[PDB]
Amino acid sequence: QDMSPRQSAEAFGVPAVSSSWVNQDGSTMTLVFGAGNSVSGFYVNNAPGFGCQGTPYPLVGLTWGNFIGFTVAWDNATANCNSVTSWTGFAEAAGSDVTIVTDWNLAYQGSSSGEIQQGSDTFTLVNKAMKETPKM
Amino acid sequence: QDMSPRQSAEAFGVPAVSSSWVNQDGSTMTLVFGAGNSVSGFYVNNAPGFGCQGTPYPLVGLTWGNFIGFTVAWDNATANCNSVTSWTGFAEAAGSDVTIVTDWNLAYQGSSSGEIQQGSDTFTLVNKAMKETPKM
Amino acid sequence: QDMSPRQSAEAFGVPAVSSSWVNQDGSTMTLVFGAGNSVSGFYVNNAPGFGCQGTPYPLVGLTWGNFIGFTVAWDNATANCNSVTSWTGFAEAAGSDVTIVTDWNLAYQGSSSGEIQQGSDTFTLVNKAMKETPKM
Amino acid sequence: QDMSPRQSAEAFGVPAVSSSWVNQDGSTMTLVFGAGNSVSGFYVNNAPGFGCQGTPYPLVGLTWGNFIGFTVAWDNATANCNSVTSWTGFAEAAGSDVTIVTDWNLAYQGSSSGEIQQGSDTFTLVNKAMKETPKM
Amino acid sequence: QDMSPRQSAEAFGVPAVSSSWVNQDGSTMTLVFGAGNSVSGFYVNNAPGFGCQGTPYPLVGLTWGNFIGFTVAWDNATANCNSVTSWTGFAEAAGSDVTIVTDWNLAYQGSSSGEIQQGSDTFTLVNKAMKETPKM
Amino acid sequence: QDMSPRQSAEAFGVPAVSSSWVNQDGSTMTLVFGAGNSVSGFYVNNAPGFGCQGTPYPLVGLTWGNFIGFTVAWDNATANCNSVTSWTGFAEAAGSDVTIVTDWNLAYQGSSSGEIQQGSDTFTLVNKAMKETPKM
Amino acid sequence: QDMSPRQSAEAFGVPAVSSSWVNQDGSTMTLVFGAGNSVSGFYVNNAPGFGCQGTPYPLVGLTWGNFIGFTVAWDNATANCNSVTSWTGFAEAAGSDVTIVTDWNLAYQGSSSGEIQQGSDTFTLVNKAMKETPKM
Amino acid sequence: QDMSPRQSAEAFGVPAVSSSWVNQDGSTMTLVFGAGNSVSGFYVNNAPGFGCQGTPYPLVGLTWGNFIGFTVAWDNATANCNSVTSWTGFAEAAGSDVTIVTDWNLAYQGSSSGEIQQGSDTFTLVNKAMKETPKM
């Protein structure tokens, strides 16, 4: 019935409970599946024109099968951008790769009220590089 | 420094760490602010045409200030609709009322392919009903 | 020695650690077996004339074998009816169905004095509804 | 909004988060109020004609204001009686004392099926005796 | 080689992680083996001349192999005797019973001074009584 | 009501929750007062003729007022002496000149059966040395 | 006198429990002071010639007063450089900045042998940037 | 995937999760491998000329493979030396003849500012002595 971390990750299409990802903007995140359909990790935004680039912010969400959603609040020790984003989407095998198709909403303060900017990210699974040394 | 539950709730616009809400469809949810910008609670969906209606599903998200994001996976002990939804939005006063303006995304399995349906929910704060009795 | 969740669930008569139930009134609850004979879940009361209807309230109890007891306090973020109810009873097959035969007591505030109302609920196990989709 | 252990105990009518009690049969229990309306402790049954007399069994329940319910499974390391009892009731000041009026149901295995035996216990608060020595 | 609860209990000479015991005075206790050599449980003193008889008091201690030590502070919700006792000893076969042979020290306040009383309790293992009705 | 760590320490006659001690043989220990009468720490045995000397072994016990009991199992990652000891005793406080008078029992394997050796240690409180460099 | 997070951070010379830092190479880290002298956080290496650049790696360590030590294992979901680094050093005013002066050792596999590289990083405290829109 | 405690130890070259060590100066420590690359334990400093000798101080660090880093803050309940040290190094394993080659840095208060002393320790693994009595 209830999914373990590994089974939840396998049902999403990934071997490991920890998984590294990059999107089309070069933005990166780590996804960690846990108990009760949970998802945790960290997101680094490298999207052109976005404040709060280049440092990690925590993410939390939930998953079932190929489907996922997660949110990031743009708050950490380095920089706050007074906004939060949630992604929702699904996972598919796209060759020997694994991708995630998502759409996202970013809620933030505009000139006269709150606004919500929409977008779309496609994430690509990154194989853990076992380098064998820290030289080069 | 960092936001306590009461502080986080206050910053969002609500006097108490737990809060009940209802949207335009009669959908209901409870929101509980915790530490490190966390958000948890339960969602009961009463949206016309939606397949997992009437029972509570866990939600989890994050907040900062007036801004919020959260996710429900459509899986509990009563019913599974093989899908997840994420909401993102902001609080704002509408008189002595408090509302949450959100846009949402629902990722689910279509005929051949993953699909993302989109929409908007507005939530209105519901004061804890204080009866002296369970009799009518 | 001591009962694990799955073991405790099995001994009670149910194949899975989480289970959904409905009584004669359409009242619903979820039951989750844990360690040390524990029982937890949520109750939604739809009993005619009852003042805290339609929303979930936490329950907690204990089990051994076919036998169970649990309590709900009529307090959540939506509504408070200044009362608590305890159920006690046993599981028994009724064909391929599983039922819980319970008697209950509700302690509440009357006109001058604390009062205890009594009754009987029968619960019937509800199989997890497995849709491929949230669309209809 | 949410009650602390002390406030929950005060709302029940007792100074301390821990409280000792004796009923009309000389049965004894300890009540420990916790967070989220919780109640834990231990029950020793000295009721004429009951197996499982004279050792403590854990209790769990919930409370709001003067109202309480809690259950005991007749299982511990000393003796199992394959049954569980839940009490429900209310607290009142009865002179300088504090009492609890409860009714209870005991679910157990009868000769041809499950049965539920009802009863009534009145518990009296016992002041912690500070003896000042273990001699006499 | 770090011991599990079952392994620790088995090395002490009992089949199970929880065990019930009785000493020469009718005093009773429950022993629970944990991780890191740990021991917890509950003690009921029915020794002639001791205050603080007839109610359970937490115990805590450690074990290695056949050897054990544990302490009870004479403080619970019912009564405080402003004193503590420690037991130290060993398990041994006495026929097909299992016993624990122990010496004990009780520290308490005398007429002018701290004092330490000493003696020996021998404990015999009690099989869990499976009565399978609470009738008798 | 319940005793806090600081309160439990102050009652015992020491101004901090963590405290350092040495006995007549130069054996040393640290005592950490916690919730629920609890006591934990480490013991370093420098007693002539004892086999498990010079390394720290965990202790646990309980306290009330100026009374205390604790045990040490003679098992850690350096050496095992297949034995356990418990101390019971009382504190005697004049300012920062604080002593614990104790008696102890050592249970171990003799040549033909279990045996218990008795002894007395006097512990004296060591004021934390605040040296401001590791240099000499 | 046992230090709280805020007290520990203040003794190190930073206002807050979390802090962001940058070293002479553009490497970045986040420091989080906890209880029991503890330190945790995340490190991003942008040092010239180092593998495992540009992603966050957990750190952990301890502190007393102005003094700190911490370790990073070069392993995360993105990349493993089969090596670990520790930093040790002290905080000092440099103008109205706050710096940490540190020496470090990196242990890694060389052509035949374990090897240890050494150097110095100086870290400067970065104020949290409150941008209050994610635009730019 | 993620490394278990046992796996992390085996990778480091030691057969148990808890392990005892001694360096050239007779300083001793215990190393405990846990989840997430984590390392904890205690360090006893017997180095000539060092101010915080003969008592255990906590360590924490991280490991990957045969590489390790850990720090000790020179603060405990016996003595504070207002300084911290970190070791980094690698294990060298031939059967049960296992060594850790390390280098260390000691940060402390000099006469005019912070200073960092460097050194090298070689640790050698000590096989847990299984002595079967505390007697000699």
Q: How far is CA C89 from the centre of its chain?
A: 10
Q: Is there a contact between B51 and B75 (Cβ–Cβ < 8 Å)?
A: no
Cβ atoms within 10 Å of C113's Cβ, excluding its own? 9
Residue E119: strand, helix, or coil: strand
Cβ atoms within 10 Å of D115's Cβ, excluding its own? 16
Q: Which two tokens stand for residue A15?
A: 């071997």
Length in residues, chain A: 136
Q: Identify residue D84 by its one-letter amino acid code.
A: V
H69 vs G100: CA distance, rounded Å: 19
CB contact (8 A) between residue D88 and residue C84: yes
H49 vs D121: CA distance, rounded Å: 71
- Which of D1, D66, D90 would you mutate first to test chain B, the one with the most B CBs within 10 A? D1
- Which of A60, A83, A113, A115 would you mutate first to test chain B, the one with the most B CBs within 10 A? A60
Do strands H56-64 and B114-126 pair parallel, antiparallel, or not at all (unpaired)?
unpaired
H44: Cβ–Cβ under 8 A, 6 or more apart, which residues? F55, F56, H27, H28, H29, H54, H55, H56, H57
Residue E34: strand, helix, or coil: coil
Q: Identify residue F94 by its one-letter amino acid code.
A: A
Distances (CA, A) of D121 to C61, D24, D47, D100: 19, 7, 10, 8
Residue A7: strand, helix, or coil: helix
Phi and psi, residue B7, nearest 5°? -65, -45
Q: Which two tokens stand for residue D111?
A: 């000769």
Which residue among C18, C56, C135 sits closest to B51, beta carbon to beta carbon? C135
* Chains adjacent to E (≥3 CB pairs closer than 8 angstroms): C, D, F, H
Q: B-side interface with A, Cβ within 8 Å?
A: 36-38, 58-75, 80, 82-90, 92, 101-109, 114, 116, 118
Closest C-alpha among G39, G34, G5 to residue G21: G39
Q: Is there a contact between H67 and G52 (Cβ–Cβ < 8 Å)?
A: no
Which residue among D20, D56, D135 sits closest to E42, beta carbon to beta carbon? D56
Q: G-side interface with A, Cβ within 8 Å?
A: 18-20, 28, 30, 42, 44, 49-52, 55-56, 74, 76-83, 106, 108-110, 126, 128-136
CA angle B6/B7/B9 to nearest 5° reads: 65
Closest C-alpha among F32, E130, A17 to residue H76: F32
* Per-residue buried b or exposed e for F65-95, using 16+ beta carbons within 10 Å of the residue's own CB: bbbbbbbbbbbbbbbbbbbbbbbbbbbeeee
CB contact (8 A) between residue C90 and residue D37: no
Residue A30: strand, helix, or coil: strand
CA dihedral of residues B105, B106, B107, B112 (deg, nearest 10): -120
Nearest chain E residue to C66 by CA distance is: E132
D92 vs D103: CA distance, rounded Å: 15
Q: Is A55 exposed, middle or buried (0-12, 13-18, 19+ CB in 10 A)?
A: buried
CB contact (8 A) between residue C133 and residue B30: no
H84 vs H63: CA distance, rounded Å: 19
Q: What are the beta bridge partners of residue B57?
A: B43
Q: Which two tokens stand for residue E133?
A: 């009705």
Closest C-alpha among E57, E53, E56, E88 to residue E70: E88
D78 vs D60: CA distance, rounded Å: 19
Asked if chain B contacts chain H via 3 or more Cβ pairs within 8 Å, the reply is: no
CB contact (8 A) between residue H60 and residue G63: no
Q: Which stretches within chain A are classed as H helix?
A: 5-12
CB contact (8 A) between residue H67 and residue G105: no
For residue C86, give the H/E element and its range.
strand C79-94
Phi and psi, residue F65, nearest 5°? 60, -130
Q: Identify residue H102 by its one-letter amino acid code.
A: T
H63 vs H58: CA distance, rounded Å: 17
Nearest chain G residue to B64 by CA distance is: G132
F126 vs G89: CA distance, rounded Å: 30
Q: Is there a contact between F54 and H26 (Cβ–Cβ < 8 Å)?
A: no
Task: Output DSSP code: residue B115.
Answer: E
Q: Which stretches within chain E are classed as H helix?
A: 5-12
How does DSSP assign C8-70, residue by residue?
A: HHHHHT-SSSEEEEEETTS-EEEEEE-STTEEEEEEE---TT-SS-SSEEEEEEEEETTEEEE
Q: Identify residue A58 by its one-letter amino acid code.
A: P
Length in residues, chain C: 136
G72 vs G107: CA distance, rounded Å: 11
Closest C-alpha among C114, C107, C29 to residue C74: C107
Q: Is there a contact between D105 and D85 (Cβ–Cβ < 8 Å)?
A: yes
Cβ atoms within 10 Å of E5's Cβ, excluding its own? 17
Residue A5: strand, helix, or coil: helix
Residue F11: strand, helix, or coil: helix
Which three-class secondary structure string do you get for E1-22?
CCCCHHHHHHHHCCCCCEEEEE
Q: Is there a contact between D33 and D16 (Cβ–Cβ < 8 Å)?
A: no
Distance from the Cα of G56 to chain A's closest Cα (Å) equals 8
Phi and psi, residue E75, nearest 5°? -145, 125
Asked if chain E contacts chain B via 3 or more Cβ pairs within 8 Å, the reply is: no
D96: Cβ–Cβ under 8 A, 6 or more apart, which residues? none
Residue A88: strand, helix, or coil: strand
- Which of D1, D74, D83, D86 would you mutate first to test chain C, the one with the most C CBs within 10 A? D86
Cβ atoms within 10 Å of E115's Cβ, excluding its own? 16
Distance from the Cα of B30 to chain C's closest Cα (Å) equals 7
B31: Cβ–Cβ under 8 A, 6 or more apart, which residues? B14, B18, B19, B21, B39, B41, B59, B70
Q: Is H45 exposed, middle or buried (0-12, 13-18, 19+ CB in 10 A)?
A: buried
CB contact (8 A) between residue F136 and residue H76: no
F contacts of D17 (beta carbons < 8 Å): 1-2
Distances (CA, A) of C14 to C20, F104, F111, G104, H74: 10, 52, 54, 58, 56
For residue D7, give the H/E element and its range.
helix D5-12
Distance from the Cα of F86 to chain G's closest Cα (Å) equals 28
G133 vs G46: CA distance, rounded Å: 27
Say what the resolution is, in angstroms: 2.2
* Chains adjacent to B (≥3 CB pairs closer than 8 angstroms): A, C, D, G
D129 vs E53: CA distance, rounded Å: 12
G contacts of H92 (beta carbons < 8 Å): 114
A96: Cβ–Cβ under 8 A, 6 or more apart, which residues? none
Phi and psi, residue D90, nearest 5°? -140, 160
Which residue among B51, B126, B136 sits closest to C133, beta carbon to beta carbon? B51
A26 vs G116: CA distance, rounded Å: 33
How many Å from the N-terminal Cα to the C-terminal Cα in chain A? 47
Q: Is there a contact between C84 and C75 (Cβ–Cβ < 8 Å)?
A: no
For residue F84, give the H/E element and its range.
strand F79-94
Closest C-alpha among A108, A101, A34 to residue A69: A101
Q: Is there a contact between G75 and H64 (Cβ–Cβ < 8 Å)?
A: yes
Q: Is there a contact between E128 and C2 (Cβ–Cβ < 8 Å)?
A: no
Q: Is there a contact between H35 and H2 (Cβ–Cβ < 8 Å)?
A: yes
Q: Is there a contact between A65 and C134 (Cβ–Cβ < 8 Å)?
A: no
CA angle D74/D77/D78 to nearest 5° reads: 75
How does DSSP assign D57-120, residue by residue?
A: EEEEEEEETTEEEEEEES-SSSEE-SEEEEEEEEEEE-SSSEEEEEEEEEEEE-SSSEEEEEEE
Residue A2: strand, helix, or coil: coil
F89 vs E63: CA distance, rounded Å: 21
Residue D5: strand, helix, or coil: helix
Phi and psi, residue H10, nearest 5°? -55, -35
CA dihedral of residues F125, F128, F129, F132 (deg, nearest 10): 180
D contacts of C87 (beta carbons < 8 Å): 86
For residue A122, give the H/E element and its range.
strand A114-126
How does DSSP assign chain G, residue by residue?
A: -PPPHHHHHHHHT-SSSEEEEEETTS-EEEEEE-STTEEEEEEE---TTBSS-SSEEEEEEEEETTEEEEEEEEE-SSEEEEEEEEEEEEEEEETTEEEEEEEEEEEEE-SSSEEEEEEEEEEEEE--EE-SSSB-
Do strands H97-109 and F56-64 pair parallel, antiparallel, or not at all (unpaired)?
unpaired
Q: Identify residue G25 by its one-letter amino acid code.
A: D
For residue H8, give the H/E element and its range.
helix H5-12
Q: Which two tokens stand for residue D16?
A: 């301390």
C contacts of B9 (beta carbons < 8 Å): none
Q: Is there a contact between F3 and F37 (Cβ–Cβ < 8 Å)?
A: yes
CA angle D64/D67/D73 to nearest 5° reads: 100
Nearest chain E residue to D127 by CA distance is: E78
E contacts of C2 (beta carbons < 8 Å): 17-18
Residue matched to tokens 């206050």: B10
Q: Identify residue F61 by its one-letter amino acid code.
A: G
Domain chopping of chain F, boundaries: 1-136
Cβ atoms within 10 Å of H79's Cβ, excluding its own? 21
E14 vs A6: CA distance, rounded Å: 36
- Contacts A–B by Cβ distance under 8 A: 158
CATH class of A1-136: mainly beta
G111: Cβ–Cβ under 8 A, 6 or more apart, which residues? none
D97 vs E79: CA distance, rounded Å: 18
Distances (CA, A) of D22 to C84, D63, D100, D122, E44: 22, 19, 10, 8, 17
Asked if chain G contacts chain E via 3 or more Cβ pairs within 8 Å, the reply is: no
D27 vs D45: CA distance, rounded Å: 5
Q: Identify residue B83 by its one-letter amino acid code.
A: S
Distance from the Cα of B67 to chain G's closest Cα (Å) equals 12
Residue B136: strand, helix, or coil: coil
Q: Is F121 exposed, middle or buried (0-12, 13-18, 19+ CB in 10 A)?
A: buried
Length in residues, chain F: 136
E79: Cβ–Cβ under 8 A, 6 or more apart, which residues? D128, D129, D130, D131, E51, E52, E55
E21 vs E12: CA distance, rounded Å: 14
D contacts of E30 (beta carbons < 8 Å): 55, 76-78
Q: What are the beta bridge partners of residue G19?
A: G31
E68 vs E14: CA distance, rounded Å: 13
Q: Which two tokens stand for residue H113?
A: 């500012």
Length in residues, chain D: 136
CA angle H69/H70/H73 to nearest 5° reads: 155
Q: Is G49 exposed, middle or buried (0-12, 13-18, 19+ CB in 10 A)?
A: exposed
Q: F-side interface with H, Cβ within 8 Å?
A: 16, 18-20, 28, 30, 42, 44, 49-52, 54-56, 74, 76-83, 106, 108-109, 126, 128-136
Residue E24: strand, helix, or coil: coil
CB contact (8 A) between residue D82 and residue E131: yes
B contacts of A99 (beta carbons < 8 Å): none
Distances (CA, A) of A23 to A28, A126, F67: 6, 10, 64
CA angle D118/D102/D94 to nearest 5° reads: 145
B contacts of A72 (beta carbons < 8 Å): 62, 69
G108 vs G119: CA distance, rounded Å: 14
Residue matched to tokens 């279509």: B110
A136 vs G108: CA distance, rounded Å: 13
Ranges of beta strands (E only) in B16-113 are 18-23, 28-33, 38-44, 56-64, 67-75, 79-94, 97-109
Closest C-alpha among D65, D92, D86 to residue D74: D86
Do strands H79-94 and H97-109 pair parallel, antiparallel, or not at all (unpaired)?
antiparallel
Distances (CA, A) of C104 to C53, C119, C121: 17, 5, 7
Closest C-alpha among C80, C78, C68 to residue C40: C68
Distance from the Cα of B43 to chain G's closest Cα (Å) equals 29
Q: C-side interface with D, Cβ within 8 Å?
A: 36-38, 58-75, 80, 82-90, 92, 101-109, 114, 116, 118
Query: What is the Rg, in whole angstroms, of the alpha carbon atoms belonging to chain E?
Result: 16
- Contacts B–G by Cβ distance under 8 A: 6
Q: Which two tokens stand for residue G86?
A: 């520790």
B124 vs B136: CA distance, rounded Å: 26
Phi and psi, residue E133, nearest 5°? -155, 150
Cβ atoms within 10 Å of E2's Cβ, excluding its own? 15
* Chains adjacent to H (≥3 CB pairs closer than 8 angstroms): A, E, F, G
H121 vs H86: CA distance, rounded Å: 11
H110 vs H116: CA distance, rounded Å: 9
Which residue among A69, A104, A116 sits closest to B89, beta carbon to beta carbon? A116
CB contact (8 A) between residue A129 and residue G80: yes
CB contact (8 A) between residue D134 and residue E106: yes
- Which of G32, G57, G81 would you mutate first to test chain A, the one with the most A CBs within 10 A? G81
Q: Which two tokens stand for residue B116?
A: 């993302």
F54 vs F58: CA distance, rounded Å: 13
Q: What are the beta bridge partners of residue E99?
A: E92, E124
Q: Is there a contact between C62 and D72 (Cβ–Cβ < 8 Å)?
A: yes
Closest C-alpha among F63, G61, G62 to residue H76: G62
Do strands D79-80 and E129-130 pair parallel, antiparallel, or not at all (unpaired)?
parallel
Distances (CA, A) of B10 to B63, B91, C82, G38: 12, 11, 27, 31
Residue H12: strand, helix, or coil: helix
